[PDB]
């Protein structure tokens, strides 16, 4: 277990050092996306919340394939604007309901430090 708090201001600095194994020790869900929304990293805590098997979703498109309920101005729209503007830091509540029991979460999206990557952080509410 990696001690990093959800919403920490310098979270992107902290997570740049972690490899996939250590991401799996976080207390919250973490997804790393490229600028097109393809999944690069998906941790164990996220799979505990959504039921997905982390290794099976890496490489899939989050908005088109895995999470169609986020294909909306309120989620996807915010991501696409942040990728265009090159800056992103927003937190909101959302409900995940595709092929799963409707689950309410807090979502934190933030630009990664390295190049064209973006974090999606999730915890239950």
Ligand X SMILES: *C(=O)/C=C/c1ccc(O)cc1
Residues at the interface with ligand X (CB under 6 A): 46, 50, 52, 66-70, 96, 98
CB of 76 to ligand X, least distance (A): 10
Residue 68 or 77: which CB sits closer to ligand X?
68
- List all residues 6 or more positions away from 61 whose beta carbon is below 8 Å from its beta carbon: 36, 37, 38, 39
- Calculate Rg over the CA atoms of the chain: 13
Nearer of residues 13 and 90 to ligand X, judged by Cβ: 90
Q: Which residue is nearest to ligand X (CB)?
A: 69
Q: How far is the CB of 73 from ligand X (least distance, A)?
A: 15
Cβ 49 vs Cβ 124: under 8 Å: yes
Which CB sits closer to ligand X, 88 or 107? 107
Cβ proximity of 124 and 105 under 8 Å: yes
Read off φ and ψ for residue 40, nearest 5 degrees. Answer: -100, -35
The pair of three-digit structure tokens given for residue 123, joined into one six-digit string: 């915890």
Cβ-based nearer residue to ligand X, 13 or 51: 51
In angstroms, give the least distance from the CB of 89 to ligand X. 19
As measured in angstroms, the least distance from the Cβ of 103 to ligand X is 9
Compute the distance between CA of residue 19 and CA of residue 51 in angstroms, rounded to an integer: 22
């Amino acid at each position: 277990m990696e001690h990093v708090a959800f919403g920490s201001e310098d979270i992107e600095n902290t997570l740049a050092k972690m490899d996939d194994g250590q991401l799996d020790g976080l207390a919250f869900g973490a997804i790393q996306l490229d600028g097109d929304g393809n999944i690069l990293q998906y941790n164990a805590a996220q799979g505990d919340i959504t039921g997905r098997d982390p290794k099976q979703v890496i490489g899939k498109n989050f908005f088109k394939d895995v999470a169609p309920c986020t294909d909306s101005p309120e989620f996807y729209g915010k991501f696409k604007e942040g990728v265009a503007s090159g800056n992103l830091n927003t937190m909101f509540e959302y409900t995940f309901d595709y092929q799963m029991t409707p689950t309410k979460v807090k979502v934190h999206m933030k630009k990664a430090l390295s190049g064209d990557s973006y974090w999606v952080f999730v915890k239950r509410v």
